[PDB]
Ligand binder design. Structure first.
Ligand SMILES: O=C(O)[C@H]1CCCN1C(=O)Nc1sc2c(c1-c1nc(C3CC3)no1)CCCC2
Length: 132
């Protein structure tokens, strides 16, 4: 019953500061513009200890992982990162490390929304998803 409140299909309904977050991460102009237009669906499922998070839009990406166990991830902007995802007080905390840099993506349930907060140095972006 780990992560039950996260499981399902979620659709993006609002975004703030995502371009600036992508700039900070180092995403190039064309990818920022196309990514910024996307209205992804996020599909979260659990089977045993394995959590799967898919992002589907007009790129489709998927990660599967066990909490606390590092994995290699190729991100939507083609960074090759080492990722670890943990549950901290009900919040899924995803840390990505690459080339001496680090970014953290937090996913939390708030009312009927799933809120995704992305942070790189001083820059925070907030993305809000609702059930599909
Ligand atoms: O899951 C979320 O809400 C947030 C969590 C952080 C990533 N993220 C996205 O939505 N990333 C998305 S969605 C999408 C693209 C990217 C994309 N991210 C980045 C770098 C910032 C990582 N570069 O492209 C490009 C093409 C198709 C649609």
């Amino acid at each position: 019953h780990m992560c039950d409140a996260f499981v399902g299909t979620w659709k993006l309904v609002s975004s703030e500061n995502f371009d600036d977050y992508m700039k900070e991460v180092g995403v190039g102009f064309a990818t920022r513009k196309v990514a910024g237009m996307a209205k992804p669906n996020m599909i979260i499922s659990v089977n045993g200890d394995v959590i799967t998070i898919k992002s589907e839009s007009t790129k489709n990406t998927e990660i599967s992982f066990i909490l606390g166990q590092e994995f290699d991830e190729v991100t939507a902007d083609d960074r090759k990162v080492k990722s670890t995802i943990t549950l901290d007080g009900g919040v899924l905390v995803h840390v990505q490390k690459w080339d001496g840099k680090s970014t953290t993506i937090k996913r939390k349930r708030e009312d009927d929304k799933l809120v995704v907060e992305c942070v790189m140095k001083g820059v925070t972006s907030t993305r809000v998803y609702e059930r599909a």
